[PDB]
Amino acid sequence: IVGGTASVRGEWPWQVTLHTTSPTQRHLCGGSIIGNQWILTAAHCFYGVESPKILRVYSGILNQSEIKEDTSFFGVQEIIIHDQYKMAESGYDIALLKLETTVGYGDSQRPICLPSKGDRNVIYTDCWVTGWGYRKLRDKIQNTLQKAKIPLVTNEECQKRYRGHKITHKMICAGYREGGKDACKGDSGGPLSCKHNEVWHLVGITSWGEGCAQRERPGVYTNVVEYVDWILEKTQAV
Numbered sequence: 001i002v003g004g005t006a007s008v009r010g011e012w013p014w015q016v017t018l019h020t021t022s023p024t025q026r027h028l029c030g031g032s033i034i035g036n037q038w039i040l041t042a043a044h045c046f047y048g049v050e051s052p053k054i055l056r057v058y059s060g061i062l063n064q065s066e067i068k069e070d071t072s073f074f075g076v077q078e079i080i081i082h083d084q085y086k087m088a089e090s091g092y093d094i095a096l097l098k099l100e101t102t103v104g105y106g107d108s109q110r111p112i113c114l115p116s117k118g119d120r121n122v123i124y125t126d127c128w129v130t131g132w133g134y135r136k137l138r139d140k141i142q143n144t145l146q147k148a149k150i151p152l153v154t155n156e157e158c159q160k161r162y163r164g165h166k167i168t169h170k171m172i173c174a175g176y177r178e179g180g181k182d183a184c185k186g187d188s189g190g191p192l193s194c195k196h197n198e199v200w201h202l203v204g205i206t207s208w209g210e211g212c213a214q215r216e217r218p219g220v221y222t223n224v225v226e227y228v229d230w231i232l233e234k235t236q237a238v
């Protein structure tokens, strides 16, 4: 996160850190708890990943230093990538992780509500991007979970900023015109959380952008409201 500030412990209890153990253990992506065995993240995170056996999901973490060999994690039973996904820049950048065990909800870890289908026509004014990603393009994974308040940008305005790309209604953009506060390397897959009527909703999934927090280059996020039916399909399967 560029221009972010340290989060407070328990502030974003749906935020998870997805680690890989291959070749060595490190933070790979962000993610969000959406159900007791479900993590919503970005499909592009799994480019290297041939097996869910190398993945570890850590919830209730503020600092990456809390993670050692003796730290409990959730194993991943299955990786479900949207079957229309080709690349982040073309959309469908959404994946689900089915966990091997159930997340026990508490003050450190709980799910975030998905947006309501009716609420597709609501103006979100209190949106925050969180993650352990870089603070600048040439940097490193941050110890403490960072947060940044970011304004949503209309599809029309986002399309003006990305000549040569196709910004679809399945994408949602966010960022200040002058730049400065945005997602960066390592924030991918994490949430874009917006508070509406005192309830937090998972409005976006950090997906892609041209550089980090550049002037007139908003962050591009998967528009979660456009995928509620797909998420229910995969999580409510009979």
Ligand SMILES: O=C(O)c1ccc(NC(=O)[C@@H]2c3ccccc3CCN2C(=O)/C=C/c2cc(Cl)ccc2-n2cnnn2)cc1
Residues within 6 Å of the ligand: 026, 027, 028, 029, 044, 045, 046, 047, 133, 140, 141, 182, 183, 184, 185, 186, 187, 188, 206, 207, 208, 209, 210, 211, 212, 213, 218, 219, 220, 221
């Ligand atoms: O350990 C590290 O150093 C390290 C760990 C994880 C990483 N992840 C990454 O790079 C991940 C990632 C993970 C797996 C596969 C592919 C990629 C490439 C994209 N990606 C980002 O997070 C994209 C952020 C991004 C998102 C928005 Cl909304 C706006 C601007 C962004 N950026 C543009 N340029 N940088 N960020 C890096 C570095």
